[PDB]
Ligand binder design. Structure first.
Ligand SMILES: CCNC(=O)c1cc2c(-c3cc(S(=O)(=O)CC)ccc3Oc3c(C)cccc3C)cn(C)c(=O)c2[nH]1
Length: 106
């Protein structure tokens, strides 16, 4: 699929190089961040590092399964954190960029 290739080379690359990307490049380490309720509240943790590994290792059935992983990453952040928190503001900025790049999807 050309769309999965676009998601890796264009969408993921643009988001990964953004200034607000770093807290989204790896799973949330709830142990080192002392968030013992994170895995109870967030049933499907998702991050860009896991999406990258999934795109590189032929995990996805289709482009929609990948777009759903990016949406899960954003809403997991909105569910766990409070509105107005910096992490929510960072996810909102990345989401706006993601929707823009996903509008030019082949
Ligand atoms: C209500 C309470 N919530 C949280 O303290 C909370 C933290 C995070 C982090 C997060 C992950 C890492 S990391 O090094 O593990 C991964 C690379 C490091 C810092 C992180 O956050 C901070 C940021 C961005 C700035 C200042 C301080 C912190 C703790 C990610 N994301 C996606 C979250 O949703 C989330 N929530």
């Amino acid at each position: 699929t050309n769309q999965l290739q676009y998601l890796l080379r264009v969408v993921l690359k643009t988001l990964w190089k953004h200034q607000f990307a770093w807290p989204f490049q790896q799973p949330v380490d709830a142990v080192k961040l002392n968030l013992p309720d994170y895995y109870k509240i967030i049933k499907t943790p998702m991050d860009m590092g896991t999406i990258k590994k999934r795109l590189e290792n032929n995990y996805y059935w289709n482009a929609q399964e990948c777009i759903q992983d990016f949406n899960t990453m954003f809403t997991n952040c909105y569910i766990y954190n409070k509105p107005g928190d910096d992490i929510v503001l960072m996810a909102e900025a990345l989401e706006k960029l993601f929707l823009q790049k996903i509008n030019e999807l082949p």
